[PDB]
Protein backbone atom coordinates (compact mmCIF):
# COMPACT_ATOMS: atom_id res chain seq x y z
CA UNK A 1 0.00 0.00 0.00
CA UNK A 2 2.66 2.58 1.20
CA UNK A 3 3.58 3.35 -2.47
CA UNK A 4 0.06 3.54 -3.66
CA UNK A 5 -1.29 5.89 -0.99
CA UNK A 6 1.04 8.57 -1.26
CA UNK A 7 0.83 9.00 -5.18
CA UNK A 8 -2.94 8.63 -4.51
CA UNK A 9 -3.12 11.62 -2.85
CA UNK A 10 -0.18 13.52 -4.93
CA UNK A 11 -1.93 12.77 -7.90
CA UNK A 12 -5.15 14.33 -7.27
CA UNK A 13 -3.60 17.41 -5.33
CA UNK A 14 -1.39 18.59 -8.86
CA UNK A 15 -5.11 18.44 -10.91
CA UNK A 16 -6.52 20.98 -8.48
CA UNK A 17 -3.58 23.45 -10.00
CA UNK A 18 -4.24 22.42 -13.49
CA UNK A 19 -7.76 23.76 -12.99
CA UNK A 20 -6.15 26.98 -10.91
CA UNK A 21 -4.38 27.26 -14.66
CA UNK A 22 -7.04 26.67 -16.21
CA UNK A 23 -8.79 29.54 -14.54
CA UNK A 24 -6.06 32.06 -14.95
CA UNK A 25 -5.86 31.21 -19.08
CA UNK A 26 -9.64 31.67 -19.39
CA UNK A 27 -9.33 34.86 -17.44
CA UNK A 28 -6.37 36.01 -19.68
CA UNK A 29 -9.22 34.98 -23.09
CA UNK A 30 -11.45 37.23 -21.52
CA UNK A 31 -9.17 39.52 -20.03
CA UNK A 32 -8.05 40.27 -23.77
CA UNK A 33 -11.27 39.85 -25.51
CA UNK A 34 -12.03 43.45 -22.76
CA UNK A 35 -9.09 44.66 -24.27
CA UNK A 36 -10.35 43.88 -27.81
CA UNK A 37 -13.60 44.80 -27.71
CA UNK A 38 -12.33 47.86 -25.80
CA UNK A 39 -10.29 48.62 -28.80
CA UNK A 40 -13.20 49.01 -31.16
CA UNK A 41 -15.23 50.87 -28.81
CA UNK A 42 -12.43 53.44 -28.56
CA UNK A 43 -11.91 53.57 -32.60
CA UNK A 44 -16.00 53.80 -32.96
CA UNK A 45 -15.30 56.76 -30.31
CA UNK A 46 -12.76 58.02 -32.63
CA UNK A 47 -14.61 58.08 -35.50
CA UNK A 48 -17.57 59.68 -33.73
CA UNK A 49 -15.26 62.94 -32.57
CA UNK A 50 -13.29 62.42 -36.16
CA UNK A 51 -17.17 62.52 -37.67
CA UNK A 52 -17.54 65.48 -35.51
CA UNK A 53 -14.39 67.33 -35.94
CA UNK A 54 -14.95 67.04 -40.19
CA UNK A 55 -19.25 68.61 -39.41
CA UNK A 56 -17.60 71.65 -37.15
CA UNK A 57 -15.00 72.21 -39.93
CA UNK A 58 -11.74 70.78 -37.78
CA UNK A 59 -10.60 68.59 -40.66
CA UNK A 60 -6.81 69.11 -38.73
CA UNK A 61 -7.96 66.93 -35.44
CA UNK A 62 -10.19 64.83 -37.93
CA UNK A 63 -6.92 63.46 -39.54
CA UNK A 64 -5.01 63.40 -36.25
CA UNK A 65 -8.20 61.29 -34.97
CA UNK A 66 -7.63 59.13 -37.96
CA UNK A 67 -4.04 57.70 -36.41
CA UNK A 68 -5.53 56.71 -33.29
CA UNK A 69 -7.74 54.64 -35.71
CA UNK A 70 -5.17 53.16 -37.25
CA UNK A 71 -3.64 52.94 -34.05
CA UNK A 72 -5.74 51.00 -32.39
CA UNK A 73 -6.43 49.10 -34.95
CA UNK A 74 -2.92 47.33 -35.46
CA UNK A 75 -3.22 46.81 -31.28
CA UNK A 76 -6.41 45.29 -31.93
CA UNK A 77 -4.82 43.25 -34.61
CA UNK A 78 -1.77 42.62 -32.31
CA UNK A 79 -4.32 41.71 -29.98
CA UNK A 80 -6.36 39.31 -31.63
CA UNK A 81 -3.49 37.57 -32.96
CA UNK A 82 -2.74 36.73 -29.36
CA UNK A 83 -6.43 35.65 -29.16
CA UNK A 84 -6.14 33.38 -31.39
CA UNK A 85 -3.19 32.02 -30.33
CA UNK A 86 -4.17 31.72 -26.39
CA UNK A 87 -7.07 29.93 -27.12
CA UNK A 88 -5.30 27.05 -28.08
CA UNK A 89 -3.53 26.56 -24.87
CA UNK A 90 -7.58 26.22 -23.28
CA UNK A 91 -8.50 23.18 -25.30
CA UNK A 92 -4.68 21.93 -24.84
CA UNK A 93 -5.06 22.15 -21.08
CA UNK A 94 -8.75 20.90 -20.95
CA UNK A 95 -7.60 17.53 -22.76
CA UNK A 96 -5.26 16.79 -20.02
CA UNK A 97 -7.85 17.07 -17.26
CA UNK A 98 -9.85 14.80 -19.55
CA UNK A 99 -7.48 12.08 -19.43
CA UNK A 100 -5.99 12.38 -15.91
CA UNK A 101 -9.48 11.99 -14.66
CA UNK A 102 -9.76 8.23 -16.04
CA UNK A 103 -6.03 7.55 -15.12
CA UNK A 104 -6.71 8.14 -11.52
CA UNK A 105 -9.76 5.71 -11.44
CA UNK A 106 -7.53 3.26 -12.83
CA UNK A 107 -4.63 3.69 -10.22
CA UNK A 108 -7.18 2.94 -6.81
CA UNK A 109 -8.38 -0.16 -9.23
CA UNK A 110 -4.56 -1.30 -9.61
CA UNK A 111 -4.63 -1.29 -5.40
CA UNK A 112 -6.67 -3.85 -5.46
CA UNK A 113 -5.12 -5.71 -7.81
CA UNK A 114 -2.08 -5.32 -6.36
CA UNK A 115 -3.34 -6.67 -2.85
CA UNK A 116 -4.73 -10.02 -4.64
CA UNK A 117 -1.39 -10.72 -6.05
CA UNK A 118 0.99 -9.84 -2.73
CA UNK A 119 -1.64 -12.03 -0.78
CA UNK A 120 -0.63 -14.83 -3.00
CA UNK A 121 3.32 -14.27 -2.65
CA UNK A 122 2.96 -14.83 1.06
CA UNK A 123 0.79 -17.30 0.83
CA UNK A 124 2.82 -19.66 -1.27
CA UNK A 125 6.17 -18.54 1.11
CA UNK A 126 3.91 -19.80 4.51
CA UNK A 127 3.68 -22.92 2.24
CA UNK A 128 7.13 -23.37 2.21
CA UNK A 129 7.84 -22.89 5.78
CA UNK A 130 5.73 -25.64 7.04
CA UNK B 1 -14.26 -6.86 -14.98
CA UNK B 2 -10.89 -7.70 -16.39
CA UNK B 3 -9.67 -7.33 -12.78
CA UNK B 4 -12.42 -9.50 -11.65
CA UNK B 5 -11.71 -12.29 -13.99
CA UNK B 6 -8.01 -11.79 -12.68
CA UNK B 7 -8.84 -11.49 -8.93
CA UNK B 8 -10.93 -14.39 -8.77
CA UNK B 9 -8.00 -17.09 -9.32
CA UNK B 10 -6.11 -15.82 -6.06
CA UNK B 11 -9.00 -16.86 -4.15
CA UNK B 12 -9.12 -20.24 -5.25
CA UNK B 13 -5.64 -20.38 -5.38
CA UNK B 14 -4.98 -19.23 -1.40
CA UNK B 15 -8.29 -21.36 -0.32
CA UNK B 16 -6.21 -24.51 -1.98
CA UNK B 17 -2.87 -23.75 0.54
CA UNK B 18 -4.85 -23.64 3.16
CA UNK B 19 -6.62 -26.77 2.72
CA UNK B 20 -2.98 -28.68 2.41
CA UNK B 21 -1.39 -26.99 5.67
CA UNK B 22 -4.47 -28.35 7.45
CA UNK B 23 -3.29 -31.93 7.08
CA UNK B 24 0.43 -30.67 6.77
CA UNK B 25 0.38 -29.37 10.53
CA UNK B 26 -1.34 -33.36 11.66
CA UNK B 27 1.56 -34.90 10.03
CA UNK B 28 3.56 -32.74 11.94
CA UNK B 29 2.15 -33.55 15.33
CA UNK B 30 2.04 -37.59 14.42
CA UNK B 31 5.43 -36.92 13.64
CA UNK B 32 6.71 -36.00 17.56
CA UNK B 33 5.10 -39.12 18.64
CA UNK B 34 7.34 -41.24 16.50
CA UNK B 35 10.26 -39.45 16.75
CA UNK B 36 10.30 -39.84 20.81
CA UNK B 37 10.25 -43.31 19.94
CA UNK B 38 13.60 -43.41 17.98
CA UNK B 39 14.89 -41.38 20.63
CA UNK B 40 14.40 -43.18 23.69
CA UNK B 41 15.45 -46.53 21.72
CA UNK B 42 18.55 -44.60 20.90
CA UNK B 43 19.09 -43.73 24.74
CA UNK B 44 18.15 -47.01 25.49
CA UNK B 45 20.87 -48.66 23.57
CA UNK B 46 23.34 -46.32 25.05
CA UNK B 47 22.68 -47.35 28.54
CA UNK B 48 23.00 -50.60 27.75
CA UNK B 49 26.41 -50.06 26.69
CA UNK B 50 27.45 -48.42 29.97
CA UNK B 51 27.28 -51.80 31.89
Redesign the interface.
Given at each position: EKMLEQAILEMQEDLVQLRQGVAQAIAAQKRSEKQYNDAQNEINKWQRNAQLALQKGDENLARQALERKKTYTDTSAALKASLDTQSTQVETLKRNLIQLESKISEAK?KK??LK??I??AK??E??QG?
Open positions: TEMARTTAQQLM
